[PDB]
Design a protein around this ligand. Structure first.
Ligand SMILES: *[C@@H]1O[C@H](CO)[C@@H](O[C@@H]2O[C@H](CO)[C@@H](O)[C@H](O)[C@H]2NC(C)=O)[C@H](O)[C@H]1NC(C)=O
Ligand SMILES: *[C@@H]1O[C@H](CO)[C@@H](O)[C@H](O)[C@H]1NC(C)=O
Ligand SMILES: *[C@@H]1O[C@H](CO)[C@@H](O)[C@H](O)[C@H]1NC(C)=O
Lengths: 49, 112
């Protein structure tokens, strides 16, 4: 799980652009602000290698 | 007294923000994932890093396909109020492979 992928949500990533966290991408209308329930937490995963 | 610029989104660089500084011996360039100045100054985590009135200094900055491109020119002048009436062209300085989502910017001043 040391190998990761960060994004899938909405506003997509430009050619050779890079992204690093500071505020939560959430999938809908909720002001999640640290919550991890429905639509909430980053769209960020780890690989089961 | 005018010596540099910050470019980014939040400008605090909690997420990647570009910084460009002239220190009178060198130009220094950084993108550091560390807290920048809250009220920016010069005294009278760095995924990319680099080191090198009578006067008008002209610059152009543009940000394309993850490159940050810089052009400049230096010239004598004899007007403080408005830019010169004549024609001249800027020439390329550096072309930096930084990969950053710049949307906002701010110049840097030296302070006593
Ligand atoms: C690049 O940065 C800009 C802001 O600097 C982001 O633009 C905002 O995106 C949200 C949705 O994610 C919109 O609701 C806002 O209206 C946008 N604001 C502006 C001023 O454009 C953009 O999403 C960022 N992209 C990536 C992939 O980092
Ligand atoms: C200018 O920056 C370089 C690189 O950071 C440093 O070695 C040098 O001491 C600086 N010059 C002054 C006058 O502080
Ligand atoms: C240093 O940068 C990484 C991202 O590359 C970040 O996770 C870490 O929290 C940063 N450290 C500080 C003190 O901001």
């Amino acid at each position: 799980y040391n190998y990761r992928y960060r994004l899938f949500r909405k506003s997509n990533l430009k050619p050779f652009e890079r992204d690093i966290s500071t505020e939560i991408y959430q999938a809908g209308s909720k002001p999640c602000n640290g919550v991890e329930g429905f639509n909430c937490y980053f769209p960020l995963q780890s690989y089961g290698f | 007294i005018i010596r540099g610029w910050i470019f980014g989104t939040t400008l605090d660089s909690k997420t990647q923000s570009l910084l460009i500084v002239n220190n009178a011996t060198n130009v220094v360039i950084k993108v550091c994932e560390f807290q920048f100045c809250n009220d920016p100054f010069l005294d009278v985590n760095c995924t990319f890093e680099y080191v090198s009135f009578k006067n008008l200094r002209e610059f152009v900055f543009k940000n394309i396909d993850g490159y940050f491109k810089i052009y400049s020119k230096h010239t004598p002048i004899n007007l403080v109020r408005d830019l010169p009436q004549g024609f001249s062209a800027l020439e390329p300085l550096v072309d930096l492979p930084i990969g950053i989502n710049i949307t906002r910017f701010q110049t840097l001043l030296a302070l006593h």
